[PDB]
Scaffold this active site. Structure first.
Site, PDB file in Angstrom:
ATOM      1  N   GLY A  23       0.821  -1.193   0.000  1.00  0.00           N
ATOM      2  CA  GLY A  23       0.000   0.000   0.000  1.00  0.00           C
ATOM      3  C   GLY A  23       0.858   1.246   0.000  1.00  0.00           C
ATOM      4  O   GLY A  23       1.951   1.244   0.570  1.00  0.00           O
ATOM      5  N   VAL A  29       3.852   4.191   3.426  1.00  0.00           N
ATOM      6  CA  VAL A  29       4.067   3.115   2.464  1.00  0.00           C
ATOM      7  C   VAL A  29       4.164   1.812   3.245  1.00  0.00           C
ATOM      8  O   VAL A  29       4.853   1.750   4.269  1.00  0.00           O
ATOM      9  CB  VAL A  29       5.339   3.334   1.623  1.00  0.00           C
ATOM     10  CG1 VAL A  29       5.527   2.189   0.643  1.00  0.00           C
ATOM     11  CG2 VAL A  29       5.269   4.666   0.880  1.00  0.00           C
ATOM     12  N   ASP A 141     -12.356   5.264  10.608  1.00  0.00           N
ATOM     13  CA  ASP A 141     -11.926   5.017   9.238  1.00  0.00           C
ATOM     14  C   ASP A 141     -12.191   3.559   8.877  1.00  0.00           C
ATOM     15  O   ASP A 141     -11.372   2.904   8.223  1.00  0.00           O
ATOM     16  CB  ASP A 141     -10.449   5.370   9.050  1.00  0.00           C
ATOM     17  CG  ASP A 141     -10.131   5.849   7.644  1.00  0.00           C
ATOM     18  OD1 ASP A 141     -11.057   6.264   6.916  1.00  0.00           O
ATOM     19  OD2 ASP A 141      -8.942   5.809   7.267  1.00  0.00           O
TER      20      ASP A 141
HETATM   21  N1  LIG Z   1      -0.434  -5.754   7.975  1.00  0.00           N
HETATM   22  C1  LIG Z   1      -0.783  -5.636   6.688  1.00  0.00           C
HETATM   23  N2  LIG Z   1      -0.784  -6.717   5.928  1.00  0.00           N
HETATM   24  C2  LIG Z   1      -1.137  -6.606   4.625  1.00  0.00           C
HETATM   25  N3  LIG Z   1      -1.487  -5.477   4.042  1.00  0.00           N
HETATM   26  C3  LIG Z   1      -1.497  -4.357   4.789  1.00  0.00           C
HETATM   27  C4  LIG Z   1      -1.142  -4.417   6.137  1.00  0.00           C
HETATM   28  N4  LIG Z   1      -1.241  -3.171   6.625  1.00  0.00           N
HETATM   29  C5  LIG Z   1      -1.642  -2.358   5.623  1.00  0.00           C
HETATM   30  N5  LIG Z   1      -1.801  -3.081   4.503  1.00  0.00           N
HETATM   31  C6  LIG Z   1      -2.210  -2.614   3.228  1.00  0.00           C
HETATM   32  O1  LIG Z   1      -1.615  -1.355   2.988  1.00  0.00           O
HETATM   33  C7  LIG Z   1      -2.658  -0.391   2.695  1.00  0.00           C
HETATM   34  C8  LIG Z   1      -2.316   0.910   3.375  1.00  0.00           C
HETATM   35  O2  LIG Z   1      -2.076   0.639   4.787  1.00  0.00           O
HETATM   36  P1  LIG Z   1      -2.802   1.527   5.892  1.00  0.00           P
HETATM   37  O3  LIG Z   1      -4.290   1.603   5.600  1.00  0.00           O
HETATM   38  O4  LIG Z   1      -2.592   0.932   7.285  1.00  0.00           O
HETATM   39  O5  LIG Z   1      -2.187   3.063   5.852  1.00  0.00           O
HETATM   40  P2  LIG Z   1      -2.636   4.373   4.946  1.00  0.00           P
HETATM   41  O6  LIG Z   1      -4.151   4.514   4.994  1.00  0.00           O
HETATM   42  O7  LIG Z   1      -2.193   4.209   3.523  1.00  0.00           O
HETATM   43  O8  LIG Z   1      -1.951   5.692   5.613  1.00  0.00           O
HETATM   44  P3  LIG Z   1      -2.369   6.546   6.959  1.00  0.00           P
HETATM   45  O9  LIG Z   1      -2.497   5.612   8.145  1.00  0.00           O
HETATM   46  O10 LIG Z   1      -1.339   7.651   7.261  1.00  0.00           O
HETATM   47  O11 LIG Z   1      -3.720   7.149   6.633  1.00  0.00           O
HETATM   48  C9  LIG Z   1      -3.946  -0.970   3.272  1.00  0.00           C
HETATM   49  O12 LIG Z   1      -5.082  -0.554   2.513  1.00  0.00           O
HETATM   50  C10 LIG Z   1      -3.730  -2.476   3.158  1.00  0.00           C
HETATM   51  O13 LIG Z   1      -4.199  -2.942   1.885  1.00  0.00           O
HETATM   52 MG   LIG Z   2      -5.992   3.349   4.877  1.00  0.00          MG
END
Ligand SMILES: Nc1ncnc2c1ncn2[C@@H]1O[C@H](COP(=O)(O)OP(=O)(O)OP(=O)(O)O)[C@@H](O)[C@H]1O
Ligand SMILES: [Mg+2]
Length: 280
Positions: A23, A29, A141
């Protein structure tokens, strides 16, 4: 500026980064990484400490505290380690191999998810949200992109991620809130009412809606129509979209998609809805 968490050199010596990018946000990232001692796959979330000229280290520390608080909860992703370098704090998270639950909401996978599967997934989501609420935490969220699956074949278990928006109940609606994807916002956010556990319950109704019909309940021609539909709670419950969805599921969704947050059941009540009382 001094560093608080383990040094980056330790990270590079214990873990291996892969080309697999899970992501990418504007200041985050998520990369797949693997331990050198055990070869166990993890998810490394890199968080930039500076966003729009603002030092956001304290905000990151908050997300870590929330992850720590819910470590005992299986429905919440686990935090394994934390590392830090000049511009980033790195969270080593339990890897969720199933990916986003958003995949199941798309029409191309509608034929592999049955009502029985949606019941289990919704029950698990409510279990994790119940835990967070019991600790006066509102996710704010709960969109399908922040709810992951441990596995896909077979369908695994729920893992809630992304706690950057988490707050204590009663917080003030700040700009960060009323600036997410418009279609997942609750009517009280558009009204600037304060934060409430009911906000997460609104999103649970959307999750269930999208899983059963494989369409978004509020998105419209443009953002303006999206906002209008949310405040007017204009949701499509026609026979065409619900010909194959049971009435119990329709009732469950309609109890959560109500304008007044006061009328929405709590996470504990939802777990008692007749729709989830399926003797698996
Ligand atoms: N532990 C994990 N295992 C697999 N995929 C993950 C994991 N954590 C996050 N992802 C993937 O990465 C994407 C982005 O991660 P995450 O939603 O936690 O942060 P973000 O929304 O991009 O940033 P922020 O928290 O600053 O708003 C998620 O939509 C998910 O698909
Ligand atoms: Mg997110």
């Amino acid at each position: 500026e001094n560093l608080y968490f383990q040094s980056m050199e330790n990270f590079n010596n214990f873990y291996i980064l892969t080309s697999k990018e899970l992501g990418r946000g504007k200041f985050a990232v998520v990369r797949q990484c693997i331990s050198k001692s055990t070869g166990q796959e993890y998810a490394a979330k890199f968080l930039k400490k500076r966003r729009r000229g603002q030092d956001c280290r304290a905000e990151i520390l908050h997300e870590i505290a929330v992850l720590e608080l819910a470590k005992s909860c299986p429905r919440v992703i686990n935090l394994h380690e934390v590392y830090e370098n000049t511009s980033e704090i790195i969270l080593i998270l339990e890897y969720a191999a199933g990916g986003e639950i958003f995949s199941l909401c798309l029409p191309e996978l509608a034929e592999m998810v049955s009502e029985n599967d949606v019941i289990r997934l919704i029950k698990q989501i409510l279990e994790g949200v119940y835990y967070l609420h019991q600790n006066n935490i509102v996710h704010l969220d709960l969109k399908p992109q922040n709810i992951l699956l441990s596995s896909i074949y077979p369908l695994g278990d729920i893992k809630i991620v992304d706690f950057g928006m988490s707050r204590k109940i009663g917080h003030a609606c700040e700009l960060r809130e009323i600036m997410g994807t418009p279609e997942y916002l609750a009517p009280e956010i558009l009204n600037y009412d304060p934060i409430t556990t009911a906000t997460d319950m609104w999103n649970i109704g959307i999750i269930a809606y999208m899983l059963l019909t494989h369409t978004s309940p509020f998105v419209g021609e443009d953002n303006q129509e999206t906002y209008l539909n949310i405040s007017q709670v204009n949701v499509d419950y026609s026979e065409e979209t619900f010909s194959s969805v049971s009435q119990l599921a329709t009732d469950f969704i309609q109890s959560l998609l109500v304008k007044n947050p006061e009328k929405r059941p709590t996470a504990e009540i939802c777990l008692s809805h007749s729709w989830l009382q399926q003797w698996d």
